[PDB]
Amino acid sequence: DKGTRVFKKASPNGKLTVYLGKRDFVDHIDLVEPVDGVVLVDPEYLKERRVYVTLTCAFRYGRLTFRKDLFVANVQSFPPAKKPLTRLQERLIKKLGEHAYPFTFEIPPNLPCSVTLQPGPEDTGKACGVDYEVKAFCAENLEEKIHKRNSVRLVIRKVQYAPERPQPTAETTRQFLMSDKPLHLEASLDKEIYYHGEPISVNVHVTNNTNKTVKKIKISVRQYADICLFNTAQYKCPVAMEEADDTVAPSSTFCKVYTLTPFLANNREKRGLALDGKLKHEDTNLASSTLLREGANREILGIIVSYKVKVKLVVSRASSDVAVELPFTLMHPKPDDIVFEDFAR
């Protein structure tokens, strides 16, 4: 239940506040939910000093050791210098004061989504990510040097969403182990797109024509993360794992459907892992697979996350391994009065 929640976060001196409809904004491949906000000022404090809002999207790396704005947009909510104005904006600006003015941002569809790479605590400096910060300040011109005091910043996320477009084709392998015939293996995934929490199922089909036998099958979801800026580097990492002692006898056919569901919740103390937020905030999940809009500069994306499901067989040969991986997309789930909460982030 409930009715419409608004997030607020006022600058230190409190003589400036900012209200947003939400903390995360969904990217729909072609269109990104707009950033519609309100900003409570105070004519007193603001003599001839105006109030601007900025939406910056920048890749960082360090703790700083490197930054890079992939995108920046500014507005001067006040003094109100077109725009048709949001539904919530109005509704809000009214029940707020005469000293409330709106600000609106549209985020370019091809921007990298919010993602941060948790590393360390040893390699603490090799940590990075792509963040979105909405900043509202009291300056005379948006070229001036900012004051922590009379300025507030909100770290909002761009989350990637992809509607289920209802193969996905299976993957195959066939090997020989001092055998006359192969150990033809092949699995496939149910959906082609899975959301966070949504559970993956892999149909494993084994046609062992070998005289050898499979001692066990290990199913896992691996998160491959690639850093593309400031420090090229590869990150493999299992985030799901089912080790079943199911066996496949000689000249026999196996076939079973395993089910894995990758939760950050488990892997909370992993080496290099891609999250879609800070490991602190209990709304952070494993970064979503990044969209590779055919013909797009990947460097500009900072981190390229992708997931695959690996099905490994442990034949006796004592111990030999046969397997195949299955690619798949991991997306972010699809979406009275007021009720104020602290942005807190």
Residue 236 marked as a ligand binder: yes
**Count of domains for the chain:** 2
- The verdict on 124 and 150 lying in the same domain is yes
How far is residue 112's CA from residue 293's CA, in Å, rounded to a whole number?
Answer: 11
Residue 312 marked as a ligand binder: yes
Residues sharing a CB contact under 8 Å with residue 300, sequence separation 6 or more, in sequence order: 70, 112
Task: Please check whether residue 117 is in contact with residue 62, taking contact to mean a CB–CB distance below 8 angstroms.
Answer: no
Task: Please check whether residue 313 is in contact with residue 248, taking contact to mean a CB–CB distance below 8 angstroms.
Answer: yes
- Which of 113, 134, 164 is the last residue in one of the domains? 164
Task: Please check whether residue 343 is in contact with residue 170, taking contact to mean a CB–CB distance below 8 angstroms.
Answer: no
- The verdict on 196 and 332 lying in the same domain is yes
DSSP-assigned letters across all residues of 181-220? S---EEEEES-SEEETTPPEEEEEEEEE-SSS-EEEEEEE
- The verdict on 226 and 262 lying in the same domain is yes
Residue 343 domain flag = no
Helix (H) or strand (E) holding 21: none
Residue 198 domain flag = yes
- Which of 130, 164, 198 is the last residue in one of the domains? 164
CATH number for the domain spanning 216: value is: 2.60.40.640
Residue 15 marked as a ligand binder: no
Quick one: which of 133, 74, 125 has its CA closest to 104?
A: 74
- The verdict on 198 and 262 lying in the same domain is yes
- Numbers of helices and strands, H then E, in the chain: 1, 23
Residue 345 domain flag = no
How far is residue 253's CA from residue 237's CA, in Å, rounded to a whole number?
Answer: 31
CATH number for the domain spanning 109: value is: 2.60.40.840
- The verdict on 87 and 17 lying in the same domain is yes
- The verdict on 68 and 176 lying in the same domain is no
Residue 225 domain flag = yes
Could you tell me the CA-to-CA distances from 180 to 72, 146, 252, 324 in Å, in that order?
63, 74, 15, 21
- The verdict on 152 and 223 lying in the same domain is no
- The phi and psi torsions of 141 (rounded to 5 degrees) equal -155, 145
Residue 253 domain flag = yes
- The verdict on 72 and 124 lying in the same domain is yes
- The verdict on 321 and 188 lying in the same domain is yes
Residue span of the structural domain in which 221 resides: 167-338
- The verdict on 17 and 157 lying in the same domain is yes
Question: Residue 62's beta-bridge partner residues?
Answer: none
Question: Residue 72's beta-bridge partner residues?
Answer: 56
- The verdict on 193 and 236 lying in the same domain is yes
Structure tokens at 344: 């807190």
Residue 108 domain flag = yes
Q: How far apart are the first and last CA of the chain?
A: 24
Between CA 51 and CA 55, with CA 52 as vertex, the angle to 5 degrees is 150
Residue 310 marked as a ligand binder: yes
Residue 344 domain flag = no
DSSP-assigned letters across all residues of 119-159? --SSSGGG-EEEEEEEEEEEESSTTSPP-STTEEEEEEEEE
How far is residue 321's CA from residue 177's CA, in Å, rounded to a whole number?
Answer: 10
The distance of Cα 342 from the centroid of its chain, to the nearest Å, equals 22
- Which of 132, 164, 196 is the last residue in one of the domains? 164
Residue 109 domain flag = yes
Q: Give the other-Cβ count within 10 Å of 296's Cβ.
A: 12
- The verdict on 224 and 322 lying in the same domain is yes
The amino acid at residue 49 is R
The amino acid at residue 71 is F
Strands 151-160 and 100-105: unpaired
